[PDB]
């Protein structure tokens, strides 16, 4: 700790005075993952392997829930041409469990693929399909020079809008009978919403036994963090999933697969200081632990 | 077997078209340099801006 004072003050000499050095943090013991009791695999083949996409004029959205389906098959095997993710990343997708997943499905030409982006202008974005400005998800414009191509027609509107109708006339009924620059492709969009409801679709990470009353790093549906898990007299409402405090700190989370009341108290942290008498006189050092019961060192 | 041969065959797509990547890893000026630009060296000047 004398050497700590020599380290912090950036000098080989120290004098009379307590010097703040660092913070005494108790390291986590072993990682714990508690995903819900669900173990089925969701049919992502009923969106990606589904190749009869729905034209952007009236596209199809698939709702999926209640599983721990893996993203590894889509992440590793890059059987696509464009993998642009806003929010999540292709590698970290396996760590988080999501409240709900909607897989938008439509087609668009080889050009104007950049119009599938938050705010990016263009006729397709102006009338057909407009992603919200605060979009969060992955866009996969996987190659369809042989699947897309007639029936796949195409033509301001709200984010995630949907309105199919027909009215010197004027009608937007346009098709495309293709058979590479002008060639249409297949575009699938995954729209995630996080931390809004009980997470239902999780990752492949195997569940791990829960631990209590110990500083342990945890992962509850994706709530990555480190802390000690204790019991509290507070009762979660049956509709409720997980609590929070000011500064968006999730102090209380009802642990899934057990539905038990828990409080994420932060691990034992205490301001470690030094009471040194100065290298001129002595070298014996005294250490302070700011506001910790002696029991915890 | 931990290793395979793709082959990078000739008349195929960009996936099978080999791009012979050469990676030039440089380093900041922190040591004597044995490689230098083709700049024409001149003399030095002392006690002058």
């Amino acid at each position, epitope marked *: 700790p004398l050497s700590e004072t020599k380290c912090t003050l950036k000098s080989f000499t120290v004098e009379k005075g307590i010097y703040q050095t660092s913070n005494f943090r108790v390291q986590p013991t072993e990682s714990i993952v508690r995903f819900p009791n669900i173990t089925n695999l969701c049919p992502f083949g009923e969106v990606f392997n589904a190749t009869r996409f729905a034209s952007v004029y009236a596209w199809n959205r698939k709702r999926i829930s209640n599983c721990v389906a893996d993203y590894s098959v889509l992440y590793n095997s890059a059987s696509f041409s464009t993998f642009k993710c806003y929010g999540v990343s292709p590698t970290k997708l396996n760590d988080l469990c999501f409240t709900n997943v909607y897989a938008d499905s439509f087609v668009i030409r080889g050009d104007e693929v950049r119009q599938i982006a938050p705010g990016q202008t263009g006729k397709i974005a102006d009338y057909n399909y407009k992603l919200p400005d605060d979009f969060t998800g992955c866009v996969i414009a996987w190659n369809s020079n042989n699947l897309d191509s*007639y029936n796949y027609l195409y033509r301001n509107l709200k984010p995630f809008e949907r309105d199919i109708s027909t009215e010197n006339c004027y009608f937007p009924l346009q098709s495309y009978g293709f058979q590479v620059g002008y060639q249409p492709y297949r575009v699938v969009v995954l729209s995630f919403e996080l931390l809004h409801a009980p997470a239902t679709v999780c990752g492949p990470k195997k569940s791990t036994n829960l631990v209590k009353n110990k500083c342990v790093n945890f992962n509850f549906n994706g709530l990555t963090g480190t802390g000690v898990l204790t019991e509290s007299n507070k009762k979660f409402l049956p509709f409720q999933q997980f609590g929070r405090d000011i500064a968006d700190t999730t102090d209380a989370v009802r642990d899934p697969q057990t539905l038990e009341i828990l409080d994420i108290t932060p691990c034992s942290f205490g301001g470690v200081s030094v009471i040194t008498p100065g290298t001129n006189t002595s070298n014996q050092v005294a250490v302070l632990y700011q506001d910790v019961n002696c029991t915890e060192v | 077997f931990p290793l395979q041969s793709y082959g990078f065959q000739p008349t195929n797509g960009v996936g099978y078209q080999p791009y012979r990547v050469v990676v030039l890893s440089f380093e900041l000026l922190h040591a004597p340099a044995t490689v230098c630009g083709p700049k024409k060296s001149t003399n030095l000047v002392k006690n002058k801006c």
Partner: antibody
Framework: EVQLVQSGAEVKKPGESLKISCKGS????????IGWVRQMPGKGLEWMGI????????RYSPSFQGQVTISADKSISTAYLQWSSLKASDTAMYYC????????????WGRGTLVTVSS | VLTQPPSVSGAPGQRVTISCTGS?????????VHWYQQLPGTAPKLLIY???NRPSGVPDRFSGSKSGTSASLAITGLQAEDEADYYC????????????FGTGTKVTVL
């Protein structure tokens, strides 16, 4: 002829590795799908796999994936069908036929090969 | 996986129909249903594509249609040459398989 042709009568023995070839000629193979079809004698036919010689994109049937290997030799317009361990119960009629997209059907068929493998 | 009437027998000069029955996810999903003629011992030939389009050179006696969960082949005026195997088609997205094949139909004329 405008067809997906193969070799003549084939008689072999189990345990040997055989890669039969299907040749494409007489059309613009770049814009169309080209694939194969299996058909057991006296039982319903099953498309095994299909490839797109435009960019050589490979697709197989769930029942017939991995057991066989194909390749679209688009430089010579050839479709392969690779067997590593031919089975005695593999006797059937194999059709290499090229299909279409959007509508997703077959419009032209090959004559097929009488593949009979027995001990 | 796409059930068909296994065998059809009929006199020459008869109007017969083949039921391309499926499920709500393969045939009744609204996707296109296509058809062929599989002459016994020879290569199959296309009969109906798109449920309304007709190939070049086909006789008009054969026509195709779809009715909800099942599809129907219109055979008008059977003749003695029509002794052949007939099989279904459709397209399935979610099933991964770009083509799906029917069980099969025998159509025989004496």
């Amino acid at each position: 002829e405008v067809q997906l042709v193969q070799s003549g009568a084939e008689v072999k023995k189990p345990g040997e590795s055989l890669k039969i070839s299907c040749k494409g000629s007489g059309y613009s193979f770049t814009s169309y799908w080209i694939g194969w079809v299996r058909q057991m004698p006296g039982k319903g036919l099953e498309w095994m796999g299909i490839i797109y010689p435009g960019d050589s994109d490979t697709r197989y049937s769930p029942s017939f994936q991995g057991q066989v290997t194909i390749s679209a030799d688009k430089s010579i317009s050839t479709a392969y069908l690779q067997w590593s361990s031919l089975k005695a119960s593999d006797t059937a009629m194999y059709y290499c036929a090229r299909g279409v997209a959007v509508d997703w059907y077959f419009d032209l068929w090959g004559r097929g090969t009488l593949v009979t493998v027995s001990s | 996986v796409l059930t068909q009437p296994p065998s059809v027998s009929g006199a020459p000069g008869q109007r017969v129909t083949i039921s391309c029955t499926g499920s709500s996810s393969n045939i009744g999903a609204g996707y296109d249903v296509h058809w062929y003629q599989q002459l016994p011992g020879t290569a199959p030939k296309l009969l109906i594509y798109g449920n309304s389009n007709r190939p070049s050179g086909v006789p008009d006696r054969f026509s195709g249609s779809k009715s909800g969960t099942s599809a129907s082949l219109a055979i008008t005026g059977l003749q003695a040459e029509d002794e052949a195997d007939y099989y279904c088609q459709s397209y399935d997205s979610s099933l991964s398989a770009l083509y799906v094949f029917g069980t099969g139909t025998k159509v025989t004329v004496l």
